[PDB]
Amino acid sequence: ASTDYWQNWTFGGGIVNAVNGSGGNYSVNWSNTGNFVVGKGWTTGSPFRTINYNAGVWAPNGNGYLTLYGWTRSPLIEYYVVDSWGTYRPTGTYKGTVKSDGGTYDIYTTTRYNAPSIDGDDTTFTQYWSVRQSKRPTGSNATITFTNHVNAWKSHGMNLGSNWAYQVMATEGYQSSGSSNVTVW
């Protein structure tokens, strides 16, 4: 069920040139940024969705993530399934591991205070992460069987909220430069 949502959020400086391409395709070119998340996906996330993507270009110069990105409310949770990165591999509080779609992921949790979210600039929420132990190869069709992550997270007491907000296959950058080109379906 193809993408219906376009994400293009920036903050803090630099240039983020994001193009909403044909179908599930988009491109990003960025320099000297603050923080940004750009991607395509779905207005309503599902714990049952298999996200398909192909990153034709993954070329961060510094810190960027190629990652599933999404939110629930009830309660407010920010989640990530990070398949690749640049110079910085994100982590948090280690819980365990999960294997999905040919990759082994470490599972982390982090509680964020006074932080920006889909609710506003100064909020509290928890983050759930699956981060691949090594960078996923790009340029070939990829799946993220998100249910495998939801199920593993649940087994370590990491339950998502019941009101689903957006769910995108994203390019995130923090204080970096780079290029990506990604198609999502």
From Swiss-Prot:
One biological process term in Gene Ontology: xylan catabolic process
A Pfam match: Glyco_hydro_11
Q: What start-end ranges are recorded for coiled-coil regions in this protein?
A: none
The answer to whether UniProt assigns keyword Magnesium to this entry is no
Which reaction equation describes what this protein catalyses?
Answer: Endohydrolysis of (1->4)-beta-D-xylosidic linkages in xylans
Cite the EC number. 3.2.1.8
Question: Which residues form each disulfide bond in the chain?
Answer: none
What InterPro entries does this protein map onto?
ConA-like_dom_sf (IPR013320), GH11/12 (IPR013319), GH11_AS_1 (IPR018208), GH11_AS_2 (IPR033119), GH11_dom (IPR033123), Glyco_hydro_11 (IPR001137)
Q: Which UniProt keywords are listed? A: Carbohydrate metabolism, Glycosidase, Hydrolase, Polysaccharide degradation, Signal, Xylan degradation
Domain of life where this protein originates: Bacteria
Which residues does the Swiss-Prot or TrEMBL record annotate as the active site? 78 (nucleophile), 172 (proton donor)
Describe the family membership recorded for this protein in Swiss-Prot or TrEMBL: Belongs to the glycosyl hydrolase 11 (cellulase G) family.
Protein name per Swiss-Prot or TrEMBL: Endo-1,4-beta-xylanase A
Give the organism, scientific name: Bacillus subtilis (strain 168)
What is the primary gene name for this protein? Answer: xynA
